Scaffold this active site. Structure first.
Site, mmCIF file in Angstrom:
data_model
loop_
_atom_site.group_PDB
_atom_site.id
_atom_site.type_symbol
_atom_site.label_atom_id
_atom_site.label_comp_id
_atom_site.label_asym_id
_atom_site.label_seq_id
_atom_site.Cartn_x
_atom_site.Cartn_y
_atom_site.Cartn_z
ATOM 1 N N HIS A 83 0.790 -1.234 0.000
ATOM 2 C CA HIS A 83 0.000 0.000 0.000
ATOM 3 C C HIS A 83 0.831 1.297 0.000
ATOM 4 O O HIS A 83 0.281 2.396 0.125
ATOM 5 C CB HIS A 83 -1.046 0.002 1.130
ATOM 6 N N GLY A 106 3.713 7.116 8.880
ATOM 7 C CA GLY A 106 5.064 6.846 8.417
ATOM 8 C C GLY A 106 5.780 5.761 9.219
ATOM 9 O O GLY A 106 6.994 5.603 9.086
ATOM 10 N N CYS A 162 4.362 2.527 9.165
ATOM 11 C CA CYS A 162 4.045 1.316 8.418
ATOM 12 C C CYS A 162 5.331 0.707 7.867
ATOM 13 O O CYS A 162 6.243 1.432 7.473
ATOM 14 C CB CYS A 162 3.067 1.605 7.281
#
EC number: 3.4.19.12
Lengths: 301, 301
Positions: A41, A143, A145
């Protein structure tokens, strides 16, 4: 003496953290050998996340659309592919700081250390449990992930978690390093149901054993019980059923303390039925279930 | 979202951990530049610890009586000296993994990360608070003495703690890196009194602010109070007095949440007076005081 929620030393993992940027999205990546792993993603915009066709979105991306940055240095992407929900970016350079590592799909109730990173920079480390409903109660800002979970057996790093999503309820979902989600979760911004969050019974018992070893004995009662009788009580308070495997795993702690597992089970029963009456066990006013029997033995040598 | 007790990444500190052996005693040492720091009671036997004259015991030791080992490699000791309760072993080699570092004597109520090591090998990492009575509630087994506490500001490692002793009560005492003990403790095996273990009020408030930010609002009441009125209540429940400095430090959290410090103080008052009635705040059934306002802001960006 003393007993604390402890992570593994994060040094070996820090050296594998990179920044992956695709379009306007930036998140963390795991650089091992000549391959960078990140959440797929990264290719999505805010709008795409509502209902993304990842195949179609990936087709619009070439190798040069992925900015992979390790500290101050840019890596050359010479090939990309989607493996389930992770993106494998092949680069021309092998990470010199690659430790000996395995990829491991961990079981619910098992624990691991999380290295929380922001855009390739490690910010901190804490211990998690993969909950029976396959969520984790972590701490992830934007930020973060692609932050990874791992265990360490001597020199070998067993990566078991990559962070992908925060659910509307504020708990966290993610994948193994093969990109397969833990639980029924998907990398889409929709309403996703996590199941009933049951307690990890074997861990609670392990922690009670740790308590005894560290001189907290007040909760020890004069009763015993049976597996079935205990489990009746377990179901009522949404505790995982206790099996003979769980009993067997607690054996060394039973052996060290001189307290049979079923006697400890009876102690737990009374704690569930009567509460703690405002007392504490190992400095906690509730029953802790994020220590495995291994975690306890590690700390109670 | 989410809120967890987090340590700093331990990578930079791991590379500075060595094994110091003198006679039959082995413990941890901190290798920075061409100097190794360790607890001076490395020179003591079990018997010596009862009543040691460290000067006299040090005189019987020469440079070659100290086995300093960094991983698999032995360092040459070319000079030794005692600075308060730490031993500074000068070696011929500068640690190539020496990070930018300061030595910092930290204040009570402040937090730091502990890298627990066994004979020069890092085993894990957890966050501590230097308690008002200058003890810590850590986790240290035998051969974990010399394990260090630190904070990290970007690239700079501020070492603030070295572990030396476990008190008969099972809490831990230690020094700064200049070898000065926190609190009235000495490196001797005698009965040593730690004072009344008061709660770090400013930290509790910071954590309540973290709670609000993460959607735990139930404890918010309709009352306010004053510094004096609050402090009356604080003294009864053995809470540190709240000063205008503490108020000022909470300002950004007050600003972010829209809740004045004295209103939060009133909320805390009712929690102290009425307890929690079996509810939880950020997954805890008691009031947490091992998060500073800085720790909260760090995690609640």
């Amino acid at each position: 003496s003393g007993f604390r929620k402890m992570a593994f030393p994060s040094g070996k993992v820090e050296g594998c953290m990179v920044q992956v940027t695709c379009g306007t999205t930036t998140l963390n990546g795991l650089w091992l050998d000549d391959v960078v792993y990140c959440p797929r993603h990264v290719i999505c915009t805010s709008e795409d996340m509502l209902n993304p066709n990842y195949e179609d979105l990936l087709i619009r991306k070439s190798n040069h659309n992925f900015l992979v940055q390790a500290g101050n240095v840019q890596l050359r992407v010479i090939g990309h592919s989607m493996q389930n929900c992770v993106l494998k970016l092949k680069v021309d350079t092998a990470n010199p700081k690659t430790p000996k590592y395995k990829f491991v799909r961990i079981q619910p109730g098992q624990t691991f250390s999380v290295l929380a990173c922001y855009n390739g920079s490690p910010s901190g480390v804490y211990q998690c449990a993969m909950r029976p409903n396959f969520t984790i109660k972590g701490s992830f800002l934007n930020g973060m992930c692609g932050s990874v979970g791992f265990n360490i057996d001597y020199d070998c790093v067993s990566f078991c978690y990559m962070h992908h999503m925060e659910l509307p309820t504020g708990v966290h979902a993610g994948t193994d390093l093969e990109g397969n989600f833990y639980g029924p979760f998907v990398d889409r911004q929709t309403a996703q149901a996590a199941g009933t969050d049951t307690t990890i019974t074997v861990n609670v018992l392990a922690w009670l054993y740790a308590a005894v070893i560290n001189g907290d004995r007040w909760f020890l009662n004069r009763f015993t019980t049976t597996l079935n009788d205990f489990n009746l009580v377990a179901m009522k308070y949404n505790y995982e059923p206790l099996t003979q495997d769980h009993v067997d795993i607690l054996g060394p702690l039973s052996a060290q303390t001189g307290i049979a597992v079923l006697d400890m089970c009876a102690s737990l029963k009374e704690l569930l039925q009567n509460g703690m009456n405002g007392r504490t066990i190992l400095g906690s006013a509730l029953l802790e279930d994020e220590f495995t029997p291994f975690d306890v033995v590690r700390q109670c040598s």
